[PDB]
A paper describes a structure:
Here, we identify CCDC61 as a highly conserved paralog of SAS6, a key organizer of the central scaffold around which centrioles are formed (Leidel et al., 2005). Our crystal structures of CCDC61 demonstrate that it adopts a SAS6-like fold and forms oligomers through two homodimerization domains in a similar way to SAS6: an N-terminal globular head and a parallel coiled-coil domain.
To further confirm higher-order oligomer formation of zCCDC611−170 in solution, we subjected this construct, as well as its F129E/D130A mutant that disrupts the head-to-head interaction in zCCDC61, to size-exclusion chromatography with multi-angle light scattering analysis. In this experiment, the His6-lipoyl domain tag of each construct was retained to stabilize the corresponding proteins at high concentrations. The results shown in Figure 2D demonstrate that the wild-type, but not the head-to-head dimerization-deficient mutant, was able to form higher-order oligomers beyond the coiled-coil-mediated dimer.
Author numbering:
A (entry chain B): 2 to 105, 110 to 165
B (entry chain A): -2 to 100, 107 to 166
């Protein structure tokens, strides 16, 4: 069976995005779509990556705990977790602000990528876990129409 | 009397001359809506037809049908629920060749080239009557609009889970 999916729309630095998170026992999929342009970014994450990422960020979390935190953030179901969406440049700035450092190229793919930041509140502190999301481009009309037909048919079935 | 209810939508996939198409027929108020999508290319064609149009078309074709009767026939054809009706999908060229075969330069325009005709083929006795529905070409759909639709469908399915 397919893993647990949550998806909600929200605004990040001036624009509206759809945020989709799919969770399985050892797999986290994050898919973000610009609602207006249909641009998409997507990352897939396993336990080792996630557990390494949380450590490097400064506050280790086990893979299923991290995923539950992300789920709550998409649902806006806990004050302790929120989200942001950053370019590489903005994440560098954030890294510099957090380290109290002043602050000093970028490939096409790097400029195009985005980072979903899971922002976790502990005490009065904020911990910014960055999930890198490679740019996918825009999706295919034939493929989307296929999905649409399937969804309508399921609506049609369950109705009867 | 037979009729398609306003608000009803029938959509089924079927093959025309070896290729897969999605065939959608919707009943709006006094308006028959027919939309066809190439499953592989996402090309779309759509036409809308009122009562007077259909009654005139069926008469010109050689066998008058009242608008609601015609609508229910087409509905039955998409469902493939009746042996008396079947469907074909043709280009202007196809339609012109078959017209000549039954018993010269042709008009040429971008619109004419790109158009399709859904043929409602009705059998009575051993006679076959071919009602041609002209469907102007729309082009391919917009990804952002399709994604919007997908999110709305998923949300609705989710609320259906509560029942």
């Amino acid at each position: 069976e397919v893993g647990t999916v949550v998806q909600e729309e929200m605004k990040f630095r001036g624009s509206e995005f759809a945020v989709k998170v799919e969770m399985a026992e050892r797999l986290l999929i994050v898919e973000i779509s610009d609602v207006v342009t249909a641009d998409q970014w997507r990352g897939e994450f396993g336990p080792a990556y996630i557990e390494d990422l949380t450590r490097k960020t400064g506050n280790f979390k086990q893979f299923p705990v991290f995923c539950s935190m992300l789920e709550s953030a998409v649902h806006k179901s806990s004050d302790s977790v929120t989200l942001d969406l950053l370019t590489y440049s903005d994440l560098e700035l954030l890294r510099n602000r957090k380290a109290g450092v002043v602050g000093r190229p970028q490939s096409p793919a790097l400029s195009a990528k985005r980072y979903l930041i899971l922002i976790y509140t502990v005490e009065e502190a904020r911990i910014h876990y960055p999930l890198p999301l490679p740019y996918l481009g825009k999706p295919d009309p034939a493929e989307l129409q296929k999905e649409i037909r399937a969804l309508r048919s399921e609506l049609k079935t369950l109705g009867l």
